[PDB]
Design a protein around this ligand. Structure first.
Ligand SMILES: O=C(O)[C@H]1CCCN(C(=O)Cc2ccc(F)cc2)C1
Length: 184
């Protein structure tokens, strides 16, 4: 792919984070803490270890990269600014999410129902491309020379978009590693 020139500098929005997350001083890394002594607010994801990027996108082409090295479970993509924050929900375009994930040694796209991904080289870094006007979200395997993972097309965004992250639970003791926004 030749999307690298649409690179944007993403930072995490502390105020949206689940109360167990630890965001680095530079707002470029997030991990599961083992409650982080913050007040509750209506923006925080309550049920899952999720956080949003601070940036909002309503036009144009945007590209960023995320490091997932040594994690067992995570979700990545974009979502509407107005997604539900409280209680249980599924990650689907109907609920305002365009995501992929790793879970139990399989990769899947967040369609409803979910779609099996075919990845021969487990990624250490994921590239995410959004074309707002075209209604496209695409995912790339940076570890495998940028190979395509998945394209959501005919997307109905229906509002501003935010970068979306889930570090996953760490019931196993094998999923403590952070998500990291990789430099341009
Ligand atoms: O499985 C369980 O009982 C624990 C899971 C994580 C810790 N638990 C909490 O209630 C607090 C919490 C909830 C959601 C979240 F994303 C992060 C922290 C219960």
């Amino acid at each position: 792919h030749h999307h690298h020139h649409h690179m944007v500098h993403i930072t995490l929005d502390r105020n949206t984070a689940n109360s167990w997350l630890i965001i680095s001083k530079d707002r470029r890394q997030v991990r599961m803490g083992d409650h982080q002594n913050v007040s509750d607010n209506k923006e925080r994801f309550s049920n899952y270890p999720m956080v949003l990027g601070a940036q909002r996108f309503s036009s144009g082409k945007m590209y960023w990269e995320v490091d997932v090295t040594q994690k067992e479970a995570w979700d990545l993509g974009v979502c509407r600014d107005s997604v539900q924050r409280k209680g249980q929900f599924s990650l689907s375009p109907e609920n305002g999410f365009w995501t992929i994930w790793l879970w139990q040694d399989s990769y899947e796209a967040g369609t409803s129902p979910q779609t099996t991904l075919h990845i021969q080289v487990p990624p250490c870094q994921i590239g995410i491309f959004v074309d707002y006007e075209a209604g496209v979200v695409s995912f790339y395997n940076i570890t495998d020379h940028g190979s395509l993972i998945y394209t959501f097309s005919e997307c109905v965004f229906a509002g501003p978009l935010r970068p979306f992250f889930n570090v996953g639970f760490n019931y196993s003791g094998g999923n403590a590693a952070p998500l990291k926004l990789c430099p341009l």
